[PDB]
């Protein structure tokens, strides 16, 4: 028995958001719903298709009939940004089945281009026969970037380790990218660039082996 | 210490009011119990402190009396109430029962059917001869059977047996067995049993000559 | 289910002891007592004793003093009756009955006024010098003479057996109307003897076979004697 | 009403982990406990339930054979053992209380969740970080930091000037490298004017390898 | 009034509550009469045998309804198992109603038999109590009240305290609430209306049983506090014959009302969970029917 959920739903602060949970004859199953905020344990927000547990606001409601269960979130606050999971119990297989989840994105939040800082290798690391370029990316929102390195305009993908975005204390996001090369490779090129793309704009920082 | 029931045998019909009397030799206060005993079965408790009806015993059963005089009463004699009844003192730690009071079914006088049986040939080979006189389905129970061998009345050589009153015709049956050694039996010709009963206007005789 | 189950029939020689058991169910054994009462063949009821299931206190009849010993076993809820130095006049059905727990104790009737309210099935105890013997079954044959109207009588003399009982049936149980099996009598010889008769129509003497089925389990005896009409 | 699970686990493949979950604010034997796992960035996977009264369990198909659920009623605690861990078992494991009160629920659903226990699976060996200075260079504000290279396992603590410097500091989440080792940077945004009078030392501490390193970050000399 | 209880599956019984209290009350009078004087403590086993003989007889009259009781059990089996016979709930509810009516009818018929056994216990108990005397009528001993309490009542007060009766009621409210919550959700999806009708019926029976348990729990709690306060007053002192006797009747009254509510609450608890076992099964079967259906 499978529960199919749209991977993403996005709404404006005052608008109402609908999260669907598809399943054959889901109308005969009792659907429970969970909200899981980023880096948090899930919380039960609707049980038995439409009932709200104590402490759950009236903005949250649910319905279920046919092949679609719906979680309706009226007057969506920014704090409602979470993954939402529907759940059923299927007696035929004796299994608790959870849907794939729906990420709720709340619009209206202002876009911030990333701040980029590129550090060339330290003399101490070069003395140890190694070379790591450090690209620090911070203060960006929506919270998603693509990172491209270059060596004299030719793209570089080998030796690149890039982190997933992370929510900062100020609600903006952060990421870091590393380029591990050999000291000989480092000294061979004229320049090295770290290009950060955020929405449709690239922020570039360039470091040269001939700098001090 | 000594209970005496009166009467010892009582003739009654279904629907009748019957009252057994139990007398004690010395005062037993109200410490008297009553019992019912159907033949071949165990007695059942009927009444406890001379009047306390035991749980589940028909309400037709009632008791009364104190000191020396006590009475058991059955208001409407039903087909099951025909049995012998016992009264019992428990004033002293040594219990004493009464002699019993038989309650039998009353019906019309039925004359017995009389049959005489000579000894079998196999029993004669054994060295003894038993002649049995059968009185079949008679009423009342009181009957006199006399054995006459060549008109000589016999005494001490016969044994009687009576059945329980019949569940379908309320009659009794009796078997009287006259026993003689082969030597004594082969010394006489006529063997007869004379039966006397209220249903017979004059004694009925059943006889045979041996051989 | 409140009940008292007693041990089976017993045949003992004069001067011997008997041990009758009485197992209780459906009640608290240690909260009551057991009374023992017997009945000699064709006679009234006679009380022999009492024992308490609570403390084992006993009260015997004066007739049985120094001969009877009733004991008890709280573990199995059983009451025993042991009568030694047995005599001919000890032949009786011995019964056990539920009684109060403190009959000795003065003013006992004020705290438990009930009579002997639950009885065991009884235990046939026969005292005798006699030895086991299967009965000799003799026919009691009808004839043209000695037939009252159209009704003929025939039977079986189940003579000289020991001990009681024997069972008589006619035609393997197929014949039941008009049959009278008489209570046995104990003869001077120490042996029992009885008659089982059947009244039948005269029209059947020469056409229907009549067999009496005597079965004396004590001596493993099974006798099927054919009763045949005497021609003469 | 709470479920408090045991702390983060770091295990090698082929090893086992017994995670605990202590119940509070209610009678532990009156409600079933479920276990659900979550791979990073992925959905909720029901692993199975346990009846805390009898100890009877029900394992999901994919978790049968290598998951064992038990409880100790004396201490209101349920456990889940993962036997013979593999790389793909890196996930947050959760314990969650069924909303049905009593035995044999006709339907199953959760109302109270534990905080999660991260189980990390790697064949890497405990290695202390090599620490490097990210010298300040070229508005009126300068960026300098430390590079905490090739350490395993998490976590590393980065302090500035023995804890005294906490403004303008940004210690960044670590990258897991293809080698199995971690690397992180800690940048501190300082006034450019301070660069000649204020000395900056980063203090790195890796408790698993018992490594404590201090690194002076001075403006690049030429 | 009469209560019909279900300790376990296939085990229906009945209690005529006023008879239970009446019979228990006169058991307390009986023991208090023999414990007042040391010269009558041995008679305890005779009182025991009498009281057990009275209940044996009481139970034999209850046994007269065995066949009508067994009838109701079978009808209840059809009601509690609609998944095994599968049609017309109304007919099944009417069936239960009349079979239950027939049991109360049998009970009412034996009213006089039940009253004679009760009135024999009253006469017995008042007989011992009316002959209770003191060496000094101005100074009657309360050692009998003390002994009887220690050996007959204190064991029940400790036993009832060890059980958390107030959490038994909390547990039952969670059961009732989650059952209605699921019931209301399933009713909106249909399936076998026979299953929803029998769930609604068993559920309402359970609320009624709960009300009786809640009511008996309040009495158990109040009487345990009242017996414990009142026992202090009637002990460790003497009384005039009149006041001692009024105090023996007052204690006996408190004990009998407490023992009654304890006996009934225990039996109603067995009934609530016996009925709950069947509600659970029907919930399991309705969910099976609903999920294994067409769209």
Numbering used by the authors:
A (entry chain C): 2 to 213
B (entry chain E): 7 to 217
C (entry chain D): 6 to 237
D (entry chain B): 7 to 144, 149 to 232
E (entry chain A): 160 to 243, 296 to 506
Question: What are the paper's exact sentences on this?
Answer:
Each member of this complex is highly conserved, essential for erythrocyte invasion, and capable of inducing cross-strain neutralizing antibodies. Here, we describe a panel of monoclonal antibodies (mAbs) that target CyRPA and that achieve greater parasite neutralization than other anti-CyRPA mAbs reported to date.
This antibody is not growth inhibitory and also prevents the binding of CyRPA to RH55. We determined a crystal structure of RH5 bound to Fab fragments from both R5.015 and growth inhibitory antibody R5.016. Comparison with the molecular model of the RCR complex shows R5.015 and CyRPA share overlapping binding sites on RH530. Consistent with these results, none of the eight anti-RH5 mAbs shown to compete with CyRPA for binding have inhibitory activity. In either case, these data make clear that vaccines to prevent blood-stage malaria should not aim to induce antibodies that block the interaction between RH5 and CyRPA.
